[PDB]
Design a protein around this nucleic acid. Structure first.
Ligand SMILES: [K+]
Ligand SMILES: [K+]
Ligand SMILES: [K+]
Ligand SMILES: [K+]
Ligand SMILES: [K+]
Ligand SMILES: [K+]
Ligand SMILES: [K+]
Ligand SMILES: [Mg+2]
Ligand SMILES: [Mg+2]
Ligand SMILES: [Mg+2]
Ligand SMILES: [Mg+2]
Ligand SMILES: [Mg+2]
Ligand SMILES: [Mg+2]
Ligand SMILES: [Mg+2]
Ligand SMILES: [Mg+2]
Ligand SMILES: [Mg+2]
Ligand SMILES: [Mg+2]
Ligand SMILES: [Mg+2]
Ligand SMILES: [Mg+2]
Ligand SMILES: [Mg+2]
Ligand SMILES: [Mg+2]
Ligand SMILES: [Mg+2]
Ligand SMILES: [Mg+2]
Ligand SMILES: [Mg+2]
Ligand SMILES: [Mg+2]
Ligand SMILES: [Mg+2]
Ligand SMILES: [Mg+2]
Lengths: 147, 261, 184, 200
RNA sequence: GAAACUGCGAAUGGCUCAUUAAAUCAGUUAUAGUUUGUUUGAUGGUUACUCGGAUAACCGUAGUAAUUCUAGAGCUAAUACGUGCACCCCGAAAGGGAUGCAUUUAUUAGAUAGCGAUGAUUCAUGAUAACUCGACGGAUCGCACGGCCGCCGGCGACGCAUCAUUCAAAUUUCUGCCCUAUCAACUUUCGAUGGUAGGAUAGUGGCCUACCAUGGUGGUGACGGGUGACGGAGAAUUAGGGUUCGAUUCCGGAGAGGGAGCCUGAGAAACGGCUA
């Protein structure tokens, strides 16, 4: 199961030992798995509404809100645990020569288990509160490379 | 800094105060109050620079310490009290009463009022939410809190506030077709009819306003202030009536004035 | 003193950060409470930013614990720390921290259970007690530990912050998870 | 070594200078707040008991209670505590100052003594005349306690007892009495009624 | 009305440019990630005709070469200090428990398309079970005197608590900086990158600890070195493009001989504050 840490992982506020049943109640009530919509026109993946993973940094089932800048880029590194490096490619204008030069920036981003990603896939990231020393973004959508 | 700044350098003061740059090193630092320091007119500016009743900083203190000036019906003795948009300033000895409104060039104008019209003001609703004990309340953009508001009132609406009963007399819902004034930005002081509302999820909402002469300008929702339902404002406007003239048109009037005057 | 600034850290690239200012008071830390289980209760009052107050518990012996399924909360004595997911050294030192698994006295909950269900683990009174006994269900794992007089509980408060050690009684799959960690 | 002898019951005080080491052996090794018999201090002090309150060393540094040494140490003191007056200094400001220990030793330059029990012959200028208190009670409850007044008995009629009369160099007559504090008057009851009225 | 206690302020201003090269800083964001004396608005339950003990000024014994260095004794105040009137459960439906506000935890409601808001929150807020050894819920002051037959009552001042507001800070998103490769690899045992659980913090965060994973950056120049490098608004010269400068009065940052540490406080790692 998802219980792989030393502590028991669960969603905060979802009581799992209630005598009554959760049939007919909203998410997060009656022991039902909690999930939410982040707004801005983004859809909640089926893997997050019907999954069993526990991720307090997940934008759909965790305790983090999306607000600020929405960016897009390509998955550059997917070797960390639930974190990827997103490469953003842009052109910098060199004024004196009236021409452009290619630049890039690597943006660390948290990716919830509901998303599948590989190097080269296109990802959309939304800003959230600091999740670690460098992570300030959460993956909101993944488009497989060549699609 | 290790805390709060108590001084305002004269060149850093808001431009709409129209302070001369060589008048001194400092400008009046607006006190905390209902309006923001960048969107207000301290009483010292009003009494000395606009009305000329006081000739110096010292004389403004004498006037206020005699309890001769009232803002929104209450006596104020703070020289840097931040009087702002729609505030009613009353001076019983001179029998005068003004409303702070923007002229079409974006500067505060002391619009003389009649004794009857000086008994109320307009306020923009900031938000409506439940307070302690589940009691609903609304707060405005002039720092006021009203409990038990009408359930129909929502954010960005305008309420007519009676300065005697201190109660909501009537309100205007924020909707397309009403007459509004711009209270911030490039178009500050312009009056028109709200024609459209463009919402952008997560971003600022833009509102397209059309002047009475067909001139259309946009601005942010935060800079709009509904003045009346339909096309007639609930308050008296200055002579320009929020009509912004081009520099060419303004020069045309000035030329004609010299010929006649 | 203890500081929470990032100036002493390496950059994400790995390069060093040359110091450009001294430590600020608004980024300070403080010594940990290291709350222990002891009958000599001691909570010291700490003045924090804004003139507000924090309560730092050095020693505690009782806590306010809630039986979630029964929706009953009682003050009870803390008996022992049995498991800690962060550091096993906090178990043998009997340190009270949030999310630590502890054993609490079962006596206060037994009294409520007898007063509520009329069971050990006045005409109108017996009318309702039997009525409540129809929908009475007690987990076998939860009942087995009432005989010993101790209930496994999880601390949900932060004793070093609020000065208290409150929690809830373990039950369901959470109880199964931790009792398997203690089965050695 | 000098001695500052004070008589709390009488309000009088006097300085005594003694140079006989054999007579000072009674005080040496004593600590603050400990009592010393005046028999060996002299003949006129027979039957007198003195309490050691403190003193200053030959460099003027004061003795501090609790410093269980005969020498000088440096302590970080708070304002207003003994050995650190801290006048004109910031609130919360601490200072490191030199303080002599609490154990009496020949290194002291003066000792402050309090007569806790008088002997046979009354000392001249210490137990002969009683100096009156400069000021009488000012709080209402203390005036009633002083004169054993009751709840119904008026208190403002007794402050005239210790009213101070005198003549000014430029005038002829002048009397002064204290203002009674915590005195229940019609105005105080009016304030209480108004405060309750506001709540309703 | 001196003095003195109490209160507040002294964290602004002024000065300077040493350190500092994605850092400061600029435009642009975010706080649903926090604190905020004051101002302004609103809001605070159904011995008491008023408690207690101290202390200053003052008074008078002083010490030391000496300092807003200092000891002892006698007095007396408070808006100082310490106190204190001030629906649910059990149940022989009597009686009892809890019953303000705040604090801490848990259960529960917060719909639908009686029932509020958002682009978005188990959010605002409600109810319930308990919890805390809670600087909270006025032992204060001025002026004016009136109306009822002792009762009632006016206009102010100051103060406590909560929310909103204002004044702000802290942290923070995106993009942007001079020369140097005779600097090509750098980071990671002792945090480097990320994960889980805690601790600490006003609060987010390897900020710190335990455990786990092996990541993170780099010819689109990392890392290192140089700067007689604070950044910007701007300044000089300019057909156009450009070159050079920007210590200095506006804004931001930083420092107070060098480091470090800290008290007081709403606010300082303060220096015309303290400790080394
Ligand atoms: K600052
Ligand atoms: K201060
Ligand atoms: K910026
Ligand atoms: K820059
Ligand atoms: K934190
Ligand atoms: K972590
Ligand atoms: K203060
Ligand atoms: Mg300054
Ligand atoms: Mg927003
Ligand atoms: Mg009094
Ligand atoms: Mg003073
Ligand atoms: Mg360098
Ligand atoms: Mg950057
Ligand atoms: Mg809630
Ligand atoms: Mg954490
Ligand atoms: Mg570690
Ligand atoms: Mg430069
Ligand atoms: Mg330099
Ligand atoms: Mg410069
Ligand atoms: Mg220089
Ligand atoms: Mg200069
Ligand atoms: Mg400057
Ligand atoms: Mg500094
Ligand atoms: Mg120097
Ligand atoms: Mg310093
Ligand atoms: Mg100096
Ligand atoms: Mg200074």
């Amino acid at each position: 199961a998802e219980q792989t840490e030393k502590a028991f992982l669960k969603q905060p506020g979802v009581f799992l030992s209630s005598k009554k049943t959760g049939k007919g109640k909203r998410p997060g009530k009656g022991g039902n798995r909690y999930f939410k919509s982040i707004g801005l026109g983004f859809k909640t993946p089926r893997e997050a509404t019907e999954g069993t993973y526990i991720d307090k940094k997940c934008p759909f089932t965790g305790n983090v809100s999306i607000r600020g800048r929405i960016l897009a880029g390509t998955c550059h590194s997917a070797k960390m645990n639930r974190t990827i490096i997103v490469r953003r490619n842009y052109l910098h204008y060199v004024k004196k020569y009236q021409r452009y030069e290619k630049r890039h920036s690597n943006i660390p981003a948290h990716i919830s288990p509901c998303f599948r990603v590989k190097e080269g896939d296109h990802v959309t990231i939304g800003q959230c509160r600091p999740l670690s020393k460098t992570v300030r973004f959460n993956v909101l959508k993944v488009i497989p490379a060549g699609s | 800094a290790r805390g709060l700044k108590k001084h305002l350098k004269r060149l850093n003061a808001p431009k709409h105060w129209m302070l001369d740059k060589l008048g001194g090193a400092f400008a009046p630092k607006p006190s905390s109050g209902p309006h923001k320091s960048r969107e207000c007119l301290p009483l010292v500016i009003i009494l000395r620079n606009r009305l000329k009743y006081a000739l110096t900083y010292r004389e403004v203190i004498s006037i206020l310490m005699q309890r001769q000036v009232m803002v929104d019906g209450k006596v104020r003795t703070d020289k840097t009290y931040p009087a702002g948009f729609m505030d009613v300033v009353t001076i019983p000895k001179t029998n005068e009463s003004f409303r702070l409104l923007y002229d079409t060039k974006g500067r505060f104008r002391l619009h003389s009022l009649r004794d009857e019209e000086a008994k109320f003001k307009l306020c923009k609703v900031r938000s409506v939410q439940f307070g302690q004990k589940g009691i609903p309340y609304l707060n405005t953009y002039d720092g006021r809190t009203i409990r038990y508001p009408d359930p129909l009132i929502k954010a960005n609406d305008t309420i007519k506030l009676d300065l005697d009963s201190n109660k909501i007399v009537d309100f205007i819902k924020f909707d397309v077709g009403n007459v509004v004034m711009v209270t911030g930005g490039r178009n500050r002081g312009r009056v028109g009819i709200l024609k459209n509302r463009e919402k952008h999820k997560g971003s600022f909402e833009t509102v397209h306003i059309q002047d009475s002469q067909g001139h259309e300008f946009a601005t942010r929702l935060g800079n709009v202030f509904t003045l009346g339902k339909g096309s007639k404002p609930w308050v008296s406007l200055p002579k320009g009536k929020g009509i912004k003239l081009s520099i060419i048109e303004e020069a045309r009037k000035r030329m004609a004035a010299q010929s006649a005057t | 003193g203890i500081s929470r600034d990032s100036m002493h850290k390496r950059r994400a690239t790995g390069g060093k950060k040359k110091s450009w200012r001294k430590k600020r008071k608004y980024e300070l830390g403080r010594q940990p409470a290291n709350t222990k289980i002891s009958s000599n209760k001691t909570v010291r009052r700490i003045r924090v930013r804004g003139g507000n107050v924090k309560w730092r518990a050095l020693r505690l012996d009782t806590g306010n614990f809630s039986w979630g399924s029964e929706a009953v909360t009682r003050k009870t004595r803390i008996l022992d720390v049995v498991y800690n997911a962060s550091n096993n050294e906090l178990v043998r030192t009997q340190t009270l921290v949030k999310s630590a698994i502890v054993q609490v006295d079962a006596a206060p909950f037994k009294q409520w259970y007898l007063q509520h269900y009329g069971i050990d683990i006045s005409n109108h009174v017996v009318r309702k007690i039997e009525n409540r006994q129809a929908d009475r269900k007690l987990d076998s794992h939860l009942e087995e530990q009432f005989a010993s007089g101790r209930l496994l509980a999880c601390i949900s408060s932060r004793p070093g912050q609020c000065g208290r050690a409150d929690g809830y009684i373990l039950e369901g799959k959470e109880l199964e998870f931790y009792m398997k960690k203690l089965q050695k | 070594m000098k001695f500052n002898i004070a008589n709390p019951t009488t309000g009088c005080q006097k300085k005594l200078e003694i140079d006989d080491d054999q007579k000072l052996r009674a005080f040496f090794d004593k600590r603050i707040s400990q009592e010393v018999s005046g028999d060996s201090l002299g003949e006129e002090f027979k039957g007198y008991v003195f309490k050691i309150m403190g003193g200053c060393d030959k460099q003027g540094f004061p003795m501090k209670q609790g410093v269980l040494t005969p020498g000088r140490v440096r302590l970080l003191l708070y304002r207003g505590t003994p050995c650190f007056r801290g006048y004109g200094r910031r609130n919360g400001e601490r200072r490191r100052k030199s303080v002599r220990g609490c154990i009496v030793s020949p290194d002291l330059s003066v000792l402050n003594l309090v007569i806790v029990k008088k002997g046979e012959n009354d000392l001249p200028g210490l137990t002969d005349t009683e100096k009156p208190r400069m000021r009488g009670p000012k709080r209402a409850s203390k005036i009633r306690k002083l004169f054993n007044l009751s709840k119904e008995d008026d208190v403002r009629k007794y402050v005239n007892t210790y009213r101070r009369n005198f003549t000014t160099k430029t005038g002829k007559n002048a009397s002064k009495a204290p203002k009674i504090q915590r005195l229940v008057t019609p105005l105080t009851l009016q304030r209480k009624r108004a405060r309750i009225a506001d709540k309703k």
